[PDB]
Every structure is written in structure tokens, then in C-alpha cells.
Symmetry: C3
Subunit: 152 residues, 3 copies
């Protein structure tokens, strides 16, 4: 095949840290889900979609790790090894947040830079669940992504 | 490109409008989320998928009215064609805790086919449920997901 | 059309059975959502995406059923009739579960069998919502699917 389709969905649950004094020593205390990444839901979903289209599994098969751009580049390199380049990708951030549009083009530029394609092959959008569900109650954010790969 | 893929997702939270008498004056009172559209979740998601495939952003850039979602849809298509694209095909998945909609599906398909100037055979619409789970399952609103494939005409 | 795109989304709410004695008679008692299938969200989502790409509606139009592979093969038969073959498929299982990777390849093989394609054209990945939402609270599981059909 010379054309592949892929999809990704990722969630980041909010969590917080606070200092505690126990036994005369200060220890950090984490509340909520324990993160093993910067929580970049947009890049994680995109990574899964690109790996997915090439049938390379998912983010959980890259480094058998925190910075998502590093994972994203690793996924693109693996898709290159198989002979693919980016046709185009589309990202949909699902978050109960207002202004993120001012940063949208900055996100596109970096993604384009990491996928070695033009910024015009990258689309990013943000929408809300209108106060509904876990994103609506602001317990976390999610993201959905689709990717089209083309044979080089 | 010669072929582009796009994705859209949208949610409509239920709200209610009731008349009230305050200060001797009749006034409208809105309960729930304040909509700024007709709440057409299927057309909103579809509109975002087509703009997304062409890298035109999202529905929130079509008109810097919104009461009618078919207008926004046509406007998105107008812009997509301006970049040289026509519809390859689209598939829409309505997510709602509801039953009978099939009688209405084909009618939806025709309207969409018309606004995208394509054949109905290029437009698919389906409805599924979350089996009573989540916000759609608890009947607090509805959602919709959509994917689109654009081609150079 | 030479290329077709499709999307699928399915959810399976948990339900358990309980034997009871009523009127001196043993009768099974069901708790929760009454299932009408094997609850396979992966094959159901996939089925919807394959039919959806060919504009054949959804899985609820196949046999006017306790085995999702039967339904999947039937779905492929109908798309096959319209002159389509599988380009590639990508499945994203959403569940608050861990060890599923050991079973993912086995799933890919079964899917590759019912779609009469190579396993290289089938991708299955699994992710969680980080304890959030209905899947995060373990009330059920969900699945997202996309499919690319090509004129055979």
C-alpha cells in the first residue's frame, strides 16, 4: 500500500504536588494520577495515529520518554524506516478551556518541524464538551487525532 | 495534496428556555449550557472534519449566521473548493442515548449531499449509544464524531 | 471512488448474572445493561467503520449475532460486493485495563483473517483515560476505529 490511515486518542488527568513534613523531613506528595510524561495529549494522540497507520502498535512500543516531542520524532523516524512520509494530519484537542487558538500555529510549526513536512499538512483545532463529562468538569483533557501516511 | 483526511468531534449539552415575569416584565430564562448555534452536532463535527482535512482550522473561523449549521457547512465547503478540493467521502457517527433515528438518517444524508455538492452515496451517517454510560448515556447531551476524505477536483 | 474512509465507535457496559430462587424455581437474574452481543467493542467498532466507509450504514443492518466475527465477515462480504478491499485498519481500544498487549497480535490475526488481508494492514492499540470517565471508573470499555477501503 502507498497510502495509510491512522488514529489516536489520549487523555491526561490533572494531578498536583504539595510538600509535607513527615518525621522531620520534607517529602513531596502527589495527588491524582501519576504522570509518566509532560502530559502533552495532542502529541501523544498524534504519535499513536502515525504509529497506528503504519501498523507499528502505539506509543507503548517506542522505548522498551517524558518529552512527547522526542516520542513524536521517534515515531516518525520508524515510519520513515518503513518508507512513509506525512500526507497530512489533523488534531482535535478536547478541553474545557477558552483561548488556546493564540498558540495553535505555534503548535503546528513544531509538529511540522518534527514530522519534516510543511505546516500546511498540519491542522490543529480545539473544542469543548460544553461542561459535560470529565473534560467538562475539568478533571483532565483529551485529544483525538487522525493521520494519513503516503509511500515515499 | 491529492488526498486529505480530516476529523471532527462536537458536543451539544441540553438546555432549556422558560418564560418568567420579573419586575412586571416578561423575560426569557435559559437553563443549562448557553448555545450559540442550533446545536447540530452532526453538522458541526462534519464541518470541522472538512476544514481540518484542508488545514483551514475549525468551525470557529467561518464568519468573524451561526443559528443555522447548514450555512456554516456550505461556507466550509466553499472555502475547501477554493483550495482545489471536492469531497471524496464522509462518515458520521452520532453518539446519543436514543432509539429511532434511522427514519431520519437518509434525510440527513440528502441534506449533507446537497450542501457538499456530492452524491448521497458519498455520505454515510450512523448512530450508536454508550449503553447508558457517560454524559450521553445519562442523557445530559449528545455528541458526534466525523471523518472526511478530500480529493483534488 | 477509488479510496474510502470510515469511522466506528462502540461501547460495552458491564453486566453480571445472578441465579435466584423464585416460586421454588431457579431463574437467572441480570444486573446492568442487557447485552445483545458478545460485547466485543473492537470488532463492532471495526464493523461500523468498514460499512461506514462504503456508505452501507452500520452494523445494525447486517442480519435483519452472538458472534462479532460473523458480523465482521458479513460486513466485509458486503463491502467486497461493492468492489472494495481493505487498505488498512487502525483500532484504539479504550479501557482501564493493563495486560492486553499479550493478546493484541492474536486479535490482529483474527481480524486479518476475516478481512482477507495481511496482518500488516491491521493495527490494534490500547490506551486508558487515566482513571477518568466511565471507562476510567471501570463501568465499561470502549473502542474507536478507522478504516481505509480501496477499490479492488
Amino acid at each position: 500500500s502507498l497510502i495509510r490511515i491512522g488514529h489516536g486518542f489520549d487523555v491526561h488527568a490533572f494531578g498536583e504536588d504539595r510538600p509535607l513534613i513527615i518525621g522531620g523531613v520534607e517529602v513531596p506528595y502527589h495527588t491524582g494520577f501519576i504522570a509518566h510524561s509532560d502530559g502533552d495529549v495532542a502529541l501523544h494522540a498524534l504519535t499513536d495515529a502515525i504509529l497506528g497507520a503504519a501498523a507499528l502498535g502505539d506509543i507503548g512500543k517506542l522505548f522498551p520518554n517524558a518529552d512527547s516531542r522526542g516520542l513524536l520524532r521517534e515515531a516518525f523516524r520508524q515510519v520513515q524506516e518503513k518508507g512513509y512520509k506525512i500526507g497530512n494530519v489533523d488534531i482535535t484537542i478536547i478541553a474545557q478551556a477558552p483561548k488556546m487558538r493564540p498558540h495553535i500555529d505555534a503548535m503546528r510549526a513544531k509538529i511540522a518541524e518534527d514530522l519534516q513536512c510543511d505546516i500546511e499538512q498540519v491542522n490543529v483545532k480545539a473544542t469543548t464538551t460544553e461542561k459535560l463529562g470529565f473534560t467538562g468538569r475539568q478533571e483532565g483533557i483529551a485529544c483525538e487525532a487522525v493521520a494519513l501516511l503516503i509511500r515515499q
